[PDB]
Design a protein around this motif. Structure first.
Motif, PDB file in Angstrom:
ATOM      1  N   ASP A 126      -5.714  12.839  -8.448  1.00 23.46           N
ATOM      2  CA  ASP A 126      -6.233  11.895  -7.415  1.00 23.46           C
ATOM      3  C   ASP A 126      -5.631  10.501  -7.617  1.00 23.46           C
ATOM      4  OD1 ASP A 126      -7.510  10.306  -5.722  1.00 23.46           O
ATOM      5  OD2 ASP A 126      -9.519  10.870  -6.263  1.00 23.46           O
ATOM      6  N   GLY A 127      -5.288   9.833  -6.546  1.00 24.25           N
ATOM      7  CA  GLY A 127      -4.698   8.466  -6.670  1.00 24.25           C
ATOM      8  C   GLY A 127      -3.220   8.507  -6.277  1.00 24.25           C
ATOM      9  N   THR A 128      -2.591   9.635  -6.434  1.00 24.53           N
ATOM     10  CA  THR A 128      -1.153   9.749  -6.068  1.00 24.53           C
ATOM     11  C   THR A 128      -1.028  10.028  -4.574  1.00 24.53           C
ATOM     12  OG1 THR A 128      -0.704  10.677  -8.238  1.00 24.53           O
ATOM     13  CG2 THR A 128       0.945  11.022  -6.515  1.00 24.53           C
ATOM     14  N   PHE A 129      -0.302   9.213  -3.857  1.00 28.71           N
ATOM     15  CA  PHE A 129      -0.165   9.466  -2.398  1.00 28.71           C
ATOM     16  C   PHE A 129       1.274   9.230  -1.946  1.00 28.71           C
ATOM     17  CE2 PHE A 129       0.670   5.933   0.492  1.00 28.71           C
ATOM     18  CZ  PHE A 129       0.966   4.956  -0.446  1.00 28.71           C
ATOM     19  N   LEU A 130       1.565   9.581  -0.724  1.00 28.24           N
ATOM     20  CA  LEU A 130       2.943   9.380  -0.189  1.00 28.24           C
ATOM     21  C   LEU A 130       2.862   8.919   1.269  1.00 28.24           C
ATOM     22  CD1 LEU A 130       4.140  12.350   1.554  1.00 28.24           C
ATOM     23  CD2 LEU A 130       2.475  12.857  -0.241  1.00 28.24           C
ATOM     24  N   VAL A 131       3.917   8.341   1.784  1.00 26.44           N
ATOM     25  CA  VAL A 131       3.896   7.876   3.203  1.00 26.44           C
ATOM     26  C   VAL A 131       4.858   8.728   4.029  1.00 26.44           C
ATOM     27  CG1 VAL A 131       4.586   6.021   4.738  1.00 26.44           C
ATOM     28  CG2 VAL A 131       3.197   5.521   2.743  1.00 26.44           C
TER      29      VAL A 131
ATOM     30  N   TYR B 120      -4.858  -0.856   0.328  1.00 25.17           N
ATOM     31  CA  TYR B 120      -5.677   0.367   0.095  1.00 25.17           C
ATOM     32  C   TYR B 120      -5.732   0.649  -1.407  1.00 25.17           C
ATOM     33  CZ  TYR B 120      -5.844   1.249   5.070  1.00 25.17           C
ATOM     34  OH  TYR B 120      -6.088   1.153   6.425  1.00 25.17           O
ATOM     35  N   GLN B 121      -4.773   0.160  -2.146  1.00 22.25           N
ATOM     36  CA  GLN B 121      -4.781   0.383  -3.618  1.00 22.25           C
ATOM     37  C   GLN B 121      -6.054  -0.233  -4.206  1.00 22.25           C
ATOM     38  OE1 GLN B 121      -5.170  -1.684  -6.002  1.00 22.25           O
ATOM     39  NE2 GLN B 121      -3.877  -1.360  -7.730  1.00 22.25           N
ATOM     40  N   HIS B 122      -6.459  -1.367  -3.702  1.00 19.50           N
ATOM     41  CA  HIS B 122      -7.688  -2.023  -4.231  1.00 19.50           C
ATOM     42  C   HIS B 122      -8.911  -1.536  -3.452  1.00 19.50           C
ATOM     43  CE1 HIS B 122      -5.498  -4.671  -6.862  1.00 19.50           C
ATOM     44  NE2 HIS B 122      -4.533  -4.720  -5.941  1.00 19.50           N
ATOM     45  N   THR B 123      -8.708  -0.971  -2.295  1.00 21.73           N
ATOM     46  CA  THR B 123      -9.869  -0.484  -1.496  1.00 21.73           C
ATOM     47  C   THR B 123     -10.031   1.022  -1.690  1.00 21.73           C
ATOM     48  OG1 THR B 123      -9.311  -2.157   0.151  1.00 21.73           O
ATOM     49  CG2 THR B 123     -10.903  -0.465   0.782  1.00 21.73           C
ATOM     50  N   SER B 124     -11.232   1.467  -1.932  1.00 20.44           N
ATOM     51  CA  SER B 124     -11.458   2.924  -2.126  1.00 20.44           C
ATOM     52  C   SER B 124     -11.689   3.586  -0.768  1.00 20.44           C
ATOM     53  CB  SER B 124     -12.679   3.136  -3.019  1.00 20.44           C
ATOM     54  OG  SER B 124     -12.953   4.528  -3.117  1.00 20.44           O
TER      55      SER B 124
ATOM     56  N   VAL C 214     -10.785   7.359  -3.491  1.00 19.14           N
ATOM     57  CA  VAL C 214      -9.395   7.336  -4.013  1.00 19.14           C
ATOM     58  C   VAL C 214      -8.690   6.087  -3.502  1.00 19.14           C
ATOM     59  CG1 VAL C 214      -8.724   8.636  -1.997  1.00 19.14           C
ATOM     60  CG2 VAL C 214      -7.167   8.433  -3.935  1.00 19.14           C
ATOM     61  N   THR C 215      -7.692   5.638  -4.202  1.00 14.59           N
ATOM     62  CA  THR C 215      -6.952   4.433  -3.745  1.00 14.59           C
ATOM     63  C   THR C 215      -5.456   4.719  -3.804  1.00 14.59           C
ATOM     64  OG1 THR C 215      -6.681   3.475  -5.938  1.00 14.59           O
ATOM     65  CG2 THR C 215      -8.776   3.094  -4.811  1.00 14.59           C
ATOM     66  N   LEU C 216      -4.671   3.977  -3.077  1.00 15.24           N
ATOM     67  CA  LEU C 216      -3.203   4.207  -3.117  1.00 15.24           C
ATOM     68  C   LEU C 216      -2.649   3.468  -4.338  1.00 15.24           C
ATOM     69  CD1 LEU C 216      -2.584   3.750   0.656  1.00 15.24           C
ATOM     70  CD2 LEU C 216      -3.210   5.768  -0.668  1.00 15.24           C
ATOM     71  N   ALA C 217      -2.995   3.919  -5.516  1.00 17.76           N
ATOM     72  CA  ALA C 217      -2.531   3.223  -6.752  1.00 17.76           C
ATOM     73  C   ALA C 217      -1.302   3.913  -7.368  1.00 17.76           C
ATOM     74  CB  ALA C 217      -3.676   3.202  -7.773  1.00 17.76           C
ATOM     75  N   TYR C 218      -1.105   5.186  -7.135  1.00 18.25           N
ATOM     76  CA  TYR C 218       0.072   5.863  -7.757  1.00 18.25           C
ATOM     77  C   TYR C 218       1.033   6.393  -6.682  1.00 18.25           C
ATOM     78  CZ  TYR C 218      -2.510   5.546 -12.077  1.00 18.25           C
ATOM     79  OH  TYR C 218      -3.182   5.080 -13.187  1.00 18.25           O
TER      80      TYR C 218
END
Length: 111
Positions: free
Chosen positions: A30-35, A85-89, A99-103
């Protein structure tokens, strides 16, 4: 330290097929995302993995779109949208998207 979010390659994978994104979202904590895009449409969507399940978040591309417009974020660019979004859940929108866009899905890992 430099944030991998600055490079789109770290999170942007291009117009990859959604099925292929599942492989990218499959095996990722969780936390890993892609665009990526909604596919053949000119819309954009950020797909992330949640400690609960893999979900596809859609990104809007309008003066008041960008995705979230209720908070008046007024993102100046998509790069800030990924970091915001990295700081926003995501928990919001169902209260179950914790989850956040941190990774990034493609971190260079230079060192």
């Amino acid at each position: 330290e430099d944030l991998p979010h600055h490079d789109e390659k770290t999170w942007n994978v291009g117009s990859s097929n959604r099925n292929k994104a599942e492989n990218l979202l499959r095996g990722k904590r969780d936390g890993t995302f892609l665009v990526r895009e909604s596919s053949k449409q000119g819309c954009y969507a950020c797909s992330v993995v949640v400690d609960g399940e893999v979900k596809h978040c859609v990104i809007n591309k309008t003066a008041t779109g960008y995705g979230f417009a209720e908070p008046y974020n007024l993102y100046s660019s998509l790069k800030e949208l990924v970091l915001h979004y990295q700081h926003t859940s995501l928990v919001q929108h169902n209260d179950s998207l914790n989850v956040t866009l941190a990774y990034p899905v493609y971190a260079q890992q230079r060192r």
